[PDB]
């Protein structure tokens, strides 16, 4: 009653002994530029002004 009253995704996802081994193949998507956030956001924040694309504009235009 009070606990989560949403949908149940075990009458379709994962339940299959097949999916246990199909989520190397069918479950293998959706999350590469959702994690081009964080990875390419906190690397280029601690490294402020030190990488090559932060300084190349000096020796780009003559």
């Amino acid at each position: 009653a009070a606990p989560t009253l949403t949908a149940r995704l075990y009458s379709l996802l994962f339940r299959r002994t097949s999916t246990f081994a199909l989520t190397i193949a069918v479950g293998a998507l959706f999350f590469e530029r959702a994690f081009d956030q964080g990875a390419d956001a906190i690397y280029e924040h601690i490294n402020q002004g030190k990488l090559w694309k932060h300084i190349k504009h000096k020796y780009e235009n003559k």
Binding site: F35, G38, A39, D40, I42, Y43, L51
Partner: protein, 48 residues
């Protein structure tokens, strides 16, 4: 002597955010199955 110094400190960020996802989610598959055994009760009733 170490030309891959910058490429490895960012590739070591693209897996630390992937083990913060994957590792809590196999640990909760583990606690689901083992709760059958963790809650069971035992009784011994021999003839008097």
């Amino acid at each position: 002597s170490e030309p891959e110094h910058d490429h490895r400190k960012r590739m070591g960020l693209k897996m630390l955010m992937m083990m913060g996802l994957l590792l809590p989610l196999v640990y909760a598959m583990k606690r689901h199955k083992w709760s059958v055994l963790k809650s069971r009760k035992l009784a011994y009733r021999p003839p008097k």
